[PDB]
Amino acid sequence: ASMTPEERAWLAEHPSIRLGVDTSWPPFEFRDEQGRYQGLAAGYVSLLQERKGVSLTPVEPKTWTQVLEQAKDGRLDLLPGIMATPERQEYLSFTRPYLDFPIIILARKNGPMPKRIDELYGLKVAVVDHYAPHELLIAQHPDLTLLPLPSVAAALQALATGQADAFVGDFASSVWNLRQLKLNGLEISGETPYRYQLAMAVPRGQPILAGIVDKVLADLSAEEIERLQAPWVGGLL
Ligand SMILES: [Cl-]
């Protein structure tokens, strides 16, 4: 729970921490039309800011692909909502995950309905570009045919309009956007063996902040965790 002496000294040197966030990933991370960072991960960030006493501020908006390049080039200090992959461990260090959801398969009601990953071979499978579902599939199922799209909404719209035959993504952002875009033509068709493990990451060359954040996240009360999720359970259920 407590910071060590070196962690306190590091916080002194970083009055501001540069955050890399997705502009269009509700309910986890989005920038409203005023440009303000919102979402479930933004709530965790606001709590970290209170605890750490330093300013955690998103930098200028970029595509998520660009954000990951910025973190490779050490042009960012913290990514608040990202899943670990083996490839990412080469340039990022991660907290332990603070939220965890299944990775599921969405279909059109008038279209094909794959039950598992093995019923995806032979279909055009939409995924959000450079999120972990995409990277897991490339590494573990190279012969699938994927359609990476820039946002969950773009991907669900591709599925809903027939441009994709299925979509693979995490449970929470898939259901949130299905209902908020009112795509009453889609449904959940199946399961994968994969979990979406939402964590925060820092450049692997500067691991102290992931240690600091991990300690704060692990020390959260049951009460605090409930309040952090309460604005967002509504449009999942
Ligand atoms: Cl990710």
JSON list of C-alpha atoms and ligand atoms in Angstrom, two decimals:
[
{"chain": "A", "resi": 1, "resn": "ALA", "atom": "CA", "xyz": [0.00, 0.00, 0.00]},
{"chain": "A", "resi": 2, "resn": "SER", "atom": "CA", "xyz": [2.75, 2.39, 1.05]},
{"chain": "A", "resi": 3, "resn": "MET", "atom": "CA", "xyz": [5.28, 3.78, -1.40]},
{"chain": "A", "resi": 4, "resn": "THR", "atom": "CA", "xyz": [8.97, 2.95, -0.88]},
{"chain": "A", "resi": 5, "resn": "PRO", "atom": "CA", "xyz": [11.53, 5.81, -0.57]},
{"chain": "A", "resi": 6, "resn": "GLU", "atom": "CA", "xyz": [12.69, 5.55, -4.20]},
{"chain": "A", "resi": 7, "resn": "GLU", "atom": "CA", "xyz": [9.09, 5.68, -5.46]},
{"chain": "A", "resi": 8, "resn": "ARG", "atom": "CA", "xyz": [8.47, 8.90, -3.53]},
{"chain": "A", "resi": 9, "resn": "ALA", "atom": "CA", "xyz": [11.60, 10.46, -5.03]},
{"chain": "A", "resi": 10, "resn": "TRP", "atom": "CA", "xyz": [10.53, 9.50, -8.55]},
{"chain": "A", "resi": 11, "resn": "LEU", "atom": "CA", "xyz": [7.17, 11.18, -8.07]},
{"chain": "A", "resi": 12, "resn": "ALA", "atom": "CA", "xyz": [9.01, 14.38, -7.14]},
{"chain": "A", "resi": 13, "resn": "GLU", "atom": "CA", "xyz": [10.71, 14.45, -10.57]},
{"chain": "A", "resi": 14, "resn": "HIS", "atom": "CA", "xyz": [7.49, 14.00, -12.57]},
{"chain": "A", "resi": 15, "resn": "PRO", "atom": "CA", "xyz": [4.98, 16.72, -11.69]},
{"chain": "A", "resi": 16, "resn": "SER", "atom": "CA", "xyz": [3.25, 15.65, -14.90]},
{"chain": "A", "resi": 17, "resn": "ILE", "atom": "CA", "xyz": [2.84, 12.18, -16.41]},
{"chain": "A", "resi": 18, "resn": "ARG", "atom": "CA", "xyz": [2.10, 11.91, -20.18]},
{"chain": "A", "resi": 19, "resn": "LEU", "atom": "CA", "xyz": [-0.78, 9.55, -20.87]},
{"chain": "A", "resi": 20, "resn": "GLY", "atom": "CA", "xyz": [-1.55, 7.69, -24.09]},
{"chain": "A", "resi": 21, "resn": "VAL", "atom": "CA", "xyz": [-5.26, 7.00, -24.43]},
{"chain": "A", "resi": 22, "resn": "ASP", "atom": "CA", "xyz": [-7.70, 5.85, -27.09]},
{"chain": "A", "resi": 23, "resn": "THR", "atom": "CA", "xyz": [-10.05, 8.56, -28.35]},
{"chain": "A", "resi": 24, "resn": "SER", "atom": "CA", "xyz": [-12.85, 6.14, -29.21]},
{"chain": "A", "resi": 25, "resn": "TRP", "atom": "CA", "xyz": [-13.01, 3.06, -26.94]},
{"chain": "A", "resi": 26, "resn": "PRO", "atom": "CA", "xyz": [-16.07, 3.41, -24.70]},
{"chain": "A", "resi": 27, "resn": "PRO", "atom": "CA", "xyz": [-16.70, 2.37, -22.00]},
{"chain": "A", "resi": 28, "resn": "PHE", "atom": "CA", "xyz": [-12.99, 2.20, -21.13]},
{"chain": "A", "resi": 29, "resn": "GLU", "atom": "CA", "xyz": [-11.47, 5.29, -22.77]},
{"chain": "A", "resi": 30, "resn": "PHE", "atom": "CA", "xyz": [-12.85, 8.04, -24.93]},
{"chain": "A", "resi": 31, "resn": "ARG", "atom": "CA", "xyz": [-12.42, 11.75, -25.53]},
{"chain": "A", "resi": 32, "resn": "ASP", "atom": "CA", "xyz": [-15.70, 13.66, -25.46]},
{"chain": "A", "resi": 33, "resn": "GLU", "atom": "CA", "xyz": [-16.39, 16.42, -27.99]},
{"chain": "A", "resi": 34, "resn": "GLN", "atom": "CA", "xyz": [-14.85, 18.93, -25.54]},
{"chain": "A", "resi": 35, "resn": "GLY", "atom": "CA", "xyz": [-11.65, 16.86, -25.80]},
{"chain": "A", "resi": 36, "resn": "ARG", "atom": "CA", "xyz": [-11.86, 15.56, -22.22]},
{"chain": "A", "resi": 37, "resn": "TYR", "atom": "CA", "xyz": [-10.73, 12.05, -21.29]},
{"chain": "A", "resi": 38, "resn": "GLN", "atom": "CA", "xyz": [-13.63, 9.91, -20.03]},
{"chain": "A", "resi": 39, "resn": "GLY", "atom": "CA", "xyz": [-14.44, 6.29, -19.29]},
{"chain": "A", "resi": 40, "resn": "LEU", "atom": "CA", "xyz": [-13.80, 3.51, -16.81]},
{"chain": "A", "resi": 41, "resn": "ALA", "atom": "CA", "xyz": [-10.02, 3.75, -17.17]},
{"chain": "A", "resi": 42, "resn": "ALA", "atom": "CA", "xyz": [-10.24, 7.55, -16.81]},
{"chain": "A", "resi": 43, "resn": "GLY", "atom": "CA", "xyz": [-11.94, 6.96, -13.44]},
{"chain": "A", "resi": 44, "resn": "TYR", "atom": "CA", "xyz": [-9.00, 4.84, -12.30]},
{"chain": "A", "resi": 45, "resn": "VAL", "atom": "CA", "xyz": [-6.66, 7.53, -13.56]},
{"chain": "A", "resi": 46, "resn": "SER", "atom": "CA", "xyz": [-8.49, 10.19, -11.56]},
{"chain": "A", "resi": 47, "resn": "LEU", "atom": "CA", "xyz": [-8.09, 8.02, -8.45]},
{"chain": "A", "resi": 48, "resn": "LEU", "atom": "CA", "xyz": [-4.36, 7.50, -9.15]},
{"chain": "A", "resi": 49, "resn": "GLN", "atom": "CA", "xyz": [-3.97, 11.25, -9.48]},
{"chain": "A", "resi": 50, "resn": "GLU", "atom": "CA", "xyz": [-5.56, 11.76, -6.05]},
{"chain": "A", "resi": 51, "resn": "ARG", "atom": "CA", "xyz": [-3.32, 9.15, -4.47]},
{"chain": "A", "resi": 52, "resn": "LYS", "atom": "CA", "xyz": [-0.03, 10.05, -6.17]},
{"chain": "A", "resi": 53, "resn": "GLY", "atom": "CA", "xyz": [-0.29, 13.81, -6.11]},
{"chain": "A", "resi": 54, "resn": "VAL", "atom": "CA", "xyz": [0.95, 14.30, -9.64]},
{"chain": "A", "resi": 55, "resn": "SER", "atom": "CA", "xyz": [-0.87, 15.41, -12.76]},
{"chain": "A", "resi": 56, "resn": "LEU", "atom": "CA", "xyz": [-1.81, 12.56, -15.13]},
{"chain": "A", "resi": 57, "resn": "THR", "atom": "CA", "xyz": [-2.64, 14.20, -18.39]},
{"chain": "A", "resi": 58, "resn": "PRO", "atom": "CA", "xyz": [-3.41, 12.75, -21.85]},
{"chain": "A", "resi": 59, "resn": "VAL", "atom": "CA", "xyz": [-1.30, 14.14, -24.66]},
{"chain": "A", "resi": 60, "resn": "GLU", "atom": "CA", "xyz": [-2.68, 15.31, -28.01]},
{"chain": "A", "resi": 61, "resn": "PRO", "atom": "CA", "xyz": [-5.05, 12.78, -29.63]},
{"chain": "A", "resi": 62, "resn": "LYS", "atom": "CA", "xyz": [-3.63, 10.22, -32.04]},
{"chain": "A", "resi": 63, "resn": "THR", "atom": "CA", "xyz": [-4.86, 6.94, -33.48]},
{"chain": "A", "resi": 64, "resn": "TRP", "atom": "CA", "xyz": [-4.33, 3.96, -31.22]},
{"chain": "A", "resi": 65, "resn": "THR", "atom": "CA", "xyz": [-1.68, 2.66, -33.63]},
{"chain": "A", "resi": 66, "resn": "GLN", "atom": "CA", "xyz": [0.12, 6.01, -33.29]},
{"chain": "A", "resi": 67, "resn": "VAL", "atom": "CA", "xyz": [-0.15, 5.87, -29.45]},
{"chain": "A", "resi": 68, "resn": "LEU", "atom": "CA", "xyz": [1.60, 2.50, -29.39]},
{"chain": "A", "resi": 69, "resn": "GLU", "atom": "CA", "xyz": [4.38, 3.89, -31.60]},
{"chain": "A", "resi": 70, "resn": "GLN", "atom": "CA", "xyz": [4.73, 6.85, -29.24]},
{"chain": "A", "resi": 71, "resn": "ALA", "atom": "CA", "xyz": [5.15, 4.45, -26.31]},
{"chain": "A", "resi": 72, "resn": "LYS", "atom": "CA", "xyz": [7.79, 2.50, -28.28]},
{"chain": "A", "resi": 73, "resn": "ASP", "atom": "CA", "xyz": [9.62, 5.79, -28.88]},
{"chain": "A", "resi": 74, "resn": "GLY", "atom": "CA", "xyz": [9.33, 6.57, -25.14]},
{"chain": "A", "resi": 75, "resn": "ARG", "atom": "CA", "xyz": [7.24, 9.65, -25.94]},
{"chain": "A", "resi": 76, "resn": "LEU", "atom": "CA", "xyz": [4.65, 8.61, -23.32]},
{"chain": "A", "resi": 77, "resn": "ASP", "atom": "CA", "xyz": [4.84, 7.70, -19.64]},
{"chain": "A", "resi": 78, "resn": "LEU", "atom": "CA", "xyz": [1.65, 5.69, -18.99]},
{"chain": "A", "resi": 79, "resn": "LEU", "atom": "CA", "xyz": [-0.98, 3.81, -21.03]},
{"chain": "A", "resi": 80, "resn": "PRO", "atom": "CA", "xyz": [-4.01, 3.40, -18.72]},
{"chain": "A", "resi": 81, "resn": "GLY", "atom": "CA", "xyz": [-5.96, 0.76, -20.64]},
{"chain": "A", "resi": 82, "resn": "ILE", "atom": "CA", "xyz": [-4.02, -1.96, -22.43]},
{"chain": "A", "resi": 83, "resn": "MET", "atom": "CA", "xyz": [-3.52, -5.71, -22.35]},
{"chain": "A", "resi": 84, "resn": "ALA", "atom": "CA", "xyz": [-0.13, -7.40, -22.18]},
{"chain": "A", "resi": 85, "resn": "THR", "atom": "CA", "xyz": [1.14, -9.56, -25.05]},
{"chain": "A", "resi": 86, "resn": "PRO", "atom": "CA", "xyz": [4.50, -11.32, -25.45]},
{"chain": "A", "resi": 87, "resn": "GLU", "atom": "CA", "xyz": [5.51, -8.85, -28.15]},
{"chain": "A", "resi": 88, "resn": "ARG", "atom": "CA", "xyz": [4.53, -5.89, -25.99]},
{"chain": "A", "resi": 89, "resn": "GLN", "atom": "CA", "xyz": [6.70, -7.08, -23.10]},
{"chain": "A", "resi": 90, "resn": "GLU", "atom": "CA", "xyz": [9.67, -6.20, -25.31]},
{"chain": "A", "resi": 91, "resn": "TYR", "atom": "CA", "xyz": [8.97, -2.48, -24.98]},
{"chain": "A", "resi": 92, "resn": "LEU", "atom": "CA", "xyz": [6.42, -2.10, -22.16]},
{"chain": "A", "resi": 93, "resn": "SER", "atom": "CA", "xyz": [6.14, -3.13, -18.54]},
{"chain": "A", "resi": 94, "resn": "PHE", "atom": "CA", "xyz": [2.66, -3.70, -17.18]},
{"chain": "A", "resi": 95, "resn": "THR", "atom": "CA", "xyz": [0.77, -3.56, -13.94]},
{"chain": "A", "resi": 96, "resn": "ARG", "atom": "CA", "xyz": [-1.22, -6.58, -13.00]},
{"chain": "A", "resi": 97, "resn": "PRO", "atom": "CA", "xyz": [-4.66, -6.40, -14.61]},
{"chain": "A", "resi": 98, "resn": "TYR", "atom": "CA", "xyz": [-7.30, -4.37, -12.84]},
{"chain": "A", "resi": 99, "resn": "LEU", "atom": "CA", "xyz": [-10.28, -5.63, -14.90]},
{"chain": "A", "resi": 100, "resn": "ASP", "atom": "CA", "xyz": [-10.80, -8.89, -16.77]},
{"chain": "A", "resi": 101, "resn": "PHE", "atom": "CA", "xyz": [-13.47, -9.89, -19.34]},
{"chain": "A", "resi": 102, "resn": "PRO", "atom": "CA", "xyz": [-13.92, -12.76, -21.80]},
{"chain": "A", "resi": 103, "resn": "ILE", "atom": "CA", "xyz": [-13.03, -12.28, -25.43]},
{"chain": "A", "resi": 104, "resn": "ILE", "atom": "CA", "xyz": [-16.20, -13.18, -27.35]},
{"chain": "A", "resi": 105, "resn": "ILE", "atom": "CA", "xyz": [-17.53, -13.62, -30.94]},
{"chain": "A", "resi": 106, "resn": "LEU", "atom": "CA", "xyz": [-20.25, -11.31, -32.28]},
{"chain": "A", "resi": 107, "resn": "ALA", "atom": "CA", "xyz": [-22.38, -12.19, -35.34]},
{"chain": "A", "resi": 108, "resn": "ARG", "atom": "CA", "xyz": [-25.23, -10.87, -37.46]},
{"chain": "A", "resi": 109, "resn": "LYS", "atom": "CA", "xyz": [-28.56, -12.59, -36.86]},
{"chain": "A", "resi": 110, "resn": "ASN", "atom": "CA", "xyz": [-29.03, -13.03, -40.63]},
{"chain": "A", "resi": 111, "resn": "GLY", "atom": "CA", "xyz": [-25.42, -14.20, -41.02]},
{"chain": "A", "resi": 112, "resn": "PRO", "atom": "CA", "xyz": [-23.06, -16.99, -40.00]},
{"chain": "A", "resi": 113, "resn": "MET", "atom": "CA", "xyz": [-22.71, -17.89, -36.30]},
{"chain": "A", "resi": 114, "resn": "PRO", "atom": "CA", "xyz": [-19.31, -19.26, -35.27]},
{"chain": "A", "resi": 115, "resn": "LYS", "atom": "CA", "xyz": [-19.25, -20.94, -31.84]},
{"chain": "A", "resi": 116, "resn": "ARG", "atom": "CA", "xyz": [-15.48, -21.17, -31.27]},
{"chain": "A", "resi": 117, "resn": "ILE", "atom": "CA", "xyz": [-12.31, -19.91, -32.95]},
{"chain": "A", "resi": 118, "resn": "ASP", "atom": "CA", "xyz": [-12.23, -23.02, -35.16]},
{"chain": "A", "resi": 119, "resn": "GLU", "atom": "CA", "xyz": [-15.50, -22.00, -36.81]},
{"chain": "A", "resi": 120, "resn": "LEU", "atom": "CA", "xyz": [-13.83, -18.70, -37.80]},
{"chain": "A", "resi": 121, "resn": "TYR", "atom": "CA", "xyz": [-11.54, -20.23, -40.45]},
{"chain": "A", "resi": 122, "resn": "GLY", "atom": "CA", "xyz": [-13.11, -19.25, -43.77]},
{"chain": "A", "resi": 123, "resn": "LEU", "atom": "CA", "xyz": [-14.82, -16.05, -42.61]},
{"chain": "A", "resi": 124, "resn": "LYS", "atom": "CA", "xyz": [-13.83, -12.38, -42.70]},
{"chain": "A", "resi": 125, "resn": "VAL", "atom": "CA", "xyz": [-13.27, -11.68, -38.99]},
{"chain": "A", "resi": 126, "resn": "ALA", "atom": "CA", "xyz": [-13.35, -8.02, -37.94]},
{"chain": "A", "resi": 127, "resn": "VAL", "atom": "CA", "xyz": [-11.19, -6.94, -34.99]},
{"chain": "A", "resi": 128, "resn": "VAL", "atom": "CA", "xyz": [-10.14, -3.59, -33.61]},
{"chain": "A", "resi": 129, "resn": "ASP", "atom": "CA", "xyz": [-6.74, -2.74, -35.07]},
{"chain": "A", "resi": 130, "resn": "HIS", "atom": "CA", "xyz": [-3.85, -3.32, -32.64]},
{"chain": "A", "resi": 131, "resn": "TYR", "atom": "CA", "xyz": [-5.89, -4.29, -29.67]},
{"chain": "A", "resi": 132, "resn": "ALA", "atom": "CA", "xyz": [-4.90, -7.54, -28.02]},
{"chain": "A", "resi": 133, "resn": "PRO", "atom": "CA", "xyz": [-7.58, -9.77, -29.64]},
{"chain": "A", "resi": 134, "resn": "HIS", "atom": "CA", "xyz": [-6.01, -8.83, -32.98]},
{"chain": "A", "resi": 135, "resn": "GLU", "atom": "CA", "xyz": [-2.46, -9.61, -31.73]},
{"chain": "A", "resi": 136, "resn": "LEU", "atom": "CA", "xyz": [-3.45, -12.88, -30.05]},
{"chain": "A", "resi": 137, "resn": "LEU", "atom": "CA", "xyz": [-5.10, -14.15, -33.24]},
{"chain": "A", "resi": 138, "resn": "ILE", "atom": "CA", "xyz": [-2.15, -13.25, -35.50]},
{"chain": "A", "resi": 139, "resn": "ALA", "atom": "CA", "xyz": [0.27, -14.98, -33.14]},
{"chain": "A", "resi": 140, "resn": "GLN", "atom": "CA", "xyz": [-1.86, -18.03, -32.35]},
{"chain": "A", "resi": 141, "resn": "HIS", "atom": "CA", "xyz": [-4.03, -18.50, -35.46]},
{"chain": "A", "resi": 142, "resn": "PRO", "atom": "CA", "xyz": [-2.08, -17.05, -38.42]},
{"chain": "A", "resi": 143, "resn": "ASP", "atom": "CA", "xyz": [-4.30, -18.64, -41.07]},
{"chain": "A", "resi": 144, "resn": "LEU", "atom": "CA", "xyz": [-7.45, -16.78, -40.09]},
{"chain": "A", "resi": 145, "resn": "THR", "atom": "CA", "xyz": [-8.50, -13.90, -42.34]},
{"chain": "A", "resi": 146, "resn": "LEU", "atom": "CA", "xyz": [-8.84, -10.74, -40.23]},
{"chain": "A", "resi": 147, "resn": "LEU", "atom": "CA", "xyz": [-10.24, -7.27, -41.04]},
{"chain": "A", "resi": 148, "resn": "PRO", "atom": "CA", "xyz": [-8.62, -4.82, -38.59]},
{"chain": "A", "resi": 149, "resn": "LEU", "atom": "CA", "xyz": [-10.67, -1.63, -38.16]},
{"chain": "A", "resi": 150, "resn": "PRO", "atom": "CA", "xyz": [-9.84, 1.58, -36.30]},
{"chain": "A", "resi": 151, "resn": "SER", "atom": "CA", "xyz": [-12.49, 1.51, -33.53]},
{"chain": "A", "resi": 152, "resn": "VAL", "atom": "CA", "xyz": [-15.01, -0.85, -31.98]},
{"chain": "A", "resi": 153, "resn": "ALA", "atom": "CA", "xyz": [-17.77, 1.20, -33.63]},
{"chain": "A", "resi": 154, "resn": "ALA", "atom": "CA", "xyz": [-16.15, 0.97, -37.05]},
{"chain": "A", "resi": 155, "resn": "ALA", "atom": "CA", "xyz": [-15.77, -2.77, -36.52]},
{"chain": "A", "resi": 156, "resn": "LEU", "atom": "CA", "xyz": [-19.36, -3.36, -35.36]},
{"chain": "A", "resi": 157, "resn": "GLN", "atom": "CA", "xyz": [-20.63, -1.24, -38.27]},
{"chain": "A", "resi": 158, "resn": "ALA", "atom": "CA", "xyz": [-18.58, -3.32, -40.68]},
{"chain": "A", "resi": 159, "resn": "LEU", "atom": "CA", "xyz": [-20.16, -6.44, -39.15]},
{"chain": "A", "resi": 160, "resn": "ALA", "atom": "CA", "xyz": [-23.66, -5.00, -39.13]},
{"chain": "A", "resi": 161, "resn": "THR", "atom": "CA", "xyz": [-23.56, -3.92, -42.79]},
{"chain": "A", "resi": 162, "resn": "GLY", "atom": "CA", "xyz": [-22.24, -7.30, -44.02]},
{"chain": "A", "resi": 163, "resn": "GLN", "atom": "CA", "xyz": [-18.66, -6.18, -44.68]},
{"chain": "A", "resi": 164, "resn": "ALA", "atom": "CA", "xyz": [-17.53, -8.60, -41.99]},
{"chain": "A", "resi": 165, "resn": "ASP", "atom": "CA", "xyz": [-18.95, -12.00, -41.13]},
{"chain": "A", "resi": 166, "resn": "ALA", "atom": "CA", "xyz": [-18.02, -11.96, -37.43]},
{"chain": "A", "resi": 167, "resn": "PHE", "atom": "CA", "xyz": [-16.27, -9.75, -34.85]},
{"chain": "A", "resi": 168, "resn": "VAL", "atom": "CA", "xyz": [-13.92, -10.84, -32.05]},
{"chain": "A", "resi": 169, "resn": "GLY", "atom": "CA", "xyz": [-13.42, -8.55, -29.08]},
{"chain": "A", "resi": 170, "resn": "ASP", "atom": "CA", "xyz": [-13.75, -8.13, -25.36]},
{"chain": "A", "resi": 171, "resn": "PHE", "atom": "CA", "xyz": [-17.16, -8.62, -23.76]},
{"chain": "A", "resi": 172, "resn": "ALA", "atom": "CA", "xyz": [-17.51, -5.14, -22.25]},
{"chain": "A", "resi": 173, "resn": "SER", "atom": "CA", "xyz": [-16.70, -2.88, -25.18]},
{"chain": "A", "resi": 174, "resn": "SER", "atom": "CA", "xyz": [-18.58, -5.19, -27.58]},
{"chain": "A", "resi": 175, "resn": "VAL", "atom": "CA", "xyz": [-21.85, -5.11, -25.65]},
{"chain": "A", "resi": 176, "resn": "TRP", "atom": "CA", "xyz": [-21.55, -1.44, -24.69]},
{"chain": "A", "resi": 177, "resn": "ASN", "atom": "CA", "xyz": [-21.20, -0.34, -28.30]},
{"chain": "A", "resi": 178, "resn": "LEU", "atom": "CA", "xyz": [-23.74, -2.81, -29.65]},
{"chain": "A", "resi": 179, "resn": "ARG", "atom": "CA", "xyz": [-26.38, -1.20, -27.41]},
{"chain": "A", "resi": 180, "resn": "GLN", "atom": "CA", "xyz": [-25.20, 2.43, -27.65]},
{"chain": "A", "resi": 181, "resn": "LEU", "atom": "CA", "xyz": [-25.12, 2.31, -31.46]},
{"chain": "A", "resi": 182, "resn": "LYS", "atom": "CA", "xyz": [-28.46, 0.43, -31.25]},
{"chain": "A", "resi": 183, "resn": "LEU", "atom": "CA", "xyz": [-27.28, -2.31, -33.59]},
{"chain": "A", "resi": 184, "resn": "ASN", "atom": "CA", "xyz": [-30.26, -4.55, -32.82]},
{"chain": "A", "resi": 185, "resn": "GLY", "atom": "CA", "xyz": [-29.16, -6.84, -35.66]},
{"chain": "A", "resi": 186, "resn": "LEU", "atom": "CA", "xyz": [-26.06, -8.26, -33.93]},
{"chain": "A", "resi": 187, "resn": "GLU", "atom": "CA", "xyz": [-25.77, -10.84, -31.16]},
{"chain": "A", "resi": 188, "resn": "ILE", "atom": "CA", "xyz": [-23.16, -12.82, -29.26]},
{"chain": "A", "resi": 189, "resn": "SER", "atom": "CA", "xyz": [-22.52, -16.08, -31.11]},
{"chain": "A", "resi": 190, "resn": "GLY", "atom": "CA", "xyz": [-19.80, -17.73, -29.05]},
{"chain": "A", "resi": 191, "resn": "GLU", "atom": "CA", "xyz": [-16.78, -17.83, -26.80]},
{"chain": "A", "resi": 192, "resn": "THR", "atom": "CA", "xyz": [-13.00, -17.91, -27.13]},
{"chain": "A", "resi": 193, "resn": "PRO", "atom": "CA", "xyz": [-10.45, -19.36, -24.69]},
{"chain": "A", "resi": 194, "resn": "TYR", "atom": "CA", "xyz": [-8.99, -15.88, -24.28]},
{"chain": "A", "resi": 195, "resn": "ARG", "atom": "CA", "xyz": [-9.40, -13.27, -21.56]},
{"chain": "A", "resi": 196, "resn": "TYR", "atom": "CA", "xyz": [-9.07, -9.52, -22.08]},
{"chain": "A", "resi": 197, "resn": "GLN", "atom": "CA", "xyz": [-6.88, -8.45, -19.13]},
{"chain": "A", "resi": 198, "resn": "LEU", "atom": "CA", "xyz": [-7.03, -4.68, -18.83]},
{"chain": "A", "resi": 199, "resn": "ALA", "atom": "CA", "xyz": [-3.88, -3.27, -17.22]},
{"chain": "A", "resi": 200, "resn": "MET", "atom": "CA", "xyz": [-1.71, -0.13, -17.37]},
{"chain": "A", "resi": 201, "resn": "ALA", "atom": "CA", "xyz": [1.71, -0.02, -19.05]},
{"chain": "A", "resi": 202, "resn": "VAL", "atom": "CA", "xyz": [4.90, 2.09, -19.00]},
{"chain": "A", "resi": 203, "resn": "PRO", "atom": "CA", "xyz": [8.05, 2.01, -21.14]},
{"chain": "A", "resi": 204, "resn": "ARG", "atom": "CA", "xyz": [10.07, -1.09, -20.20]},
{"chain": "A", "resi": 205, "resn": "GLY", "atom": "CA", "xyz": [13.11, 1.17, -19.71]},
{"chain": "A", "resi": 206, "resn": "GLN", "atom": "CA", "xyz": [11.30, 3.08, -16.91]},
{"chain": "A", "resi": 207, "resn": "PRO", "atom": "CA", "xyz": [9.48, 0.42, -14.84]},
{"chain": "A", "resi": 208, "resn": "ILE", "atom": "CA", "xyz": [9.11, 2.29, -11.51]},
{"chain": "A", "resi": 209, "resn": "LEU", "atom": "CA", "xyz": [5.75, 3.89, -12.38]},
{"chain": "A", "resi": 210, "resn": "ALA", "atom": "CA", "xyz": [4.16, 0.49, -13.17]},
{"chain": "A", "resi": 211, "resn": "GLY", "atom": "CA", "xyz": [5.30, -0.63, -9.72]},
{"chain": "A", "resi": 212, "resn": "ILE", "atom": "CA", "xyz": [3.77, 2.48, -8.15]},
{"chain": "A", "resi": 213, "resn": "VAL", "atom": "CA", "xyz": [0.47, 2.12, -9.99]},
{"chain": "A", "resi": 214, "resn": "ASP", "atom": "CA", "xyz": [0.27, -1.61, -9.37]},
{"chain": "A", "resi": 215, "resn": "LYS", "atom": "CA", "xyz": [0.57, -1.03, -5.61]},
{"chain": "A", "resi": 216, "resn": "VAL", "atom": "CA", "xyz": [-2.24, 1.54, -5.68]},
{"chain": "A", "resi": 217, "resn": "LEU", "atom": "CA", "xyz": [-4.53, -0.63, -7.80]},
{"chain": "A", "resi": 218, "resn": "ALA", "atom": "CA", "xyz": [-3.96, -3.70, -5.59]},
{"chain": "A", "resi": 219, "resn": "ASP", "atom": "CA", "xyz": [-4.79, -1.70, -2.43]},
{"chain": "A", "resi": 220, "resn": "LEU", "atom": "CA", "xyz": [-8.22, -0.45, -3.61]},
{"chain": "A", "resi": 221, "resn": "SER", "atom": "CA", "xyz": [-11.14, -1.15, -1.30]},
{"chain": "A", "resi": 222, "resn": "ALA", "atom": "CA", "xyz": [-14.10, -3.22, -2.41]},
{"chain": "A", "resi": 223, "resn": "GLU", "atom": "CA", "xyz": [-16.07, 0.01, -1.99]},
{"chain": "A", "resi": 224, "resn": "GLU", "atom": "CA", "xyz": [-13.75, 1.99, -4.26]},
{"chain": "A", "resi": 225, "resn": "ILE", "atom": "CA", "xyz": [-13.83, -0.72, -6.96]},
{"chain": "A", "resi": 226, "resn": "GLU", "atom": "CA", "xyz": [-17.63, -0.72, -6.92]},
{"chain": "A", "resi": 227, "resn": "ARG", "atom": "CA", "xyz": [-17.83, 3.07, -7.31]},
{"chain": "A", "resi": 228, "resn": "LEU", "atom": "CA", "xyz": [-15.29, 3.01, -10.15]},
{"chain": "A", "resi": 229, "resn": "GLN", "atom": "CA", "xyz": [-17.48, 0.65, -12.15]},
{"chain": "A", "resi": 230, "resn": "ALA", "atom": "CA", "xyz": [-20.96, 1.89, -11.17]},
{"chain": "A", "resi": 231, "resn": "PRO", "atom": "CA", "xyz": [-21.44, 4.54, -13.95]},
{"chain": "A", "resi": 232, "resn": "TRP", "atom": "CA", "xyz": [-20.65, 1.87, -16.55]},
{"chain": "A", "resi": 233, "resn": "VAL", "atom": "CA", "xyz": [-22.48, -1.32, -15.52]},
{"chain": "A", "resi": 234, "resn": "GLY", "atom": "CA", "xyz": [-25.76, 0.27, -16.65]},
{"chain": "A", "resi": 235, "resn": "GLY", "atom": "CA", "xyz": [-25.21, 0.14, -20.42]},
{"chain": "A", "resi": 236, "resn": "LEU", "atom": "CA", "xyz": [-23.63, -3.31, -20.10]},
{"chain": "A", "resi": 237, "resn": "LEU", "atom": "CA", "xyz": [-26.78, -4.60, -18.40]},
{"chain": "B", "resi": 1, "resn": "CL", "atom": "CL", "xyz": [-5.07, -4.03, -25.89]}
]
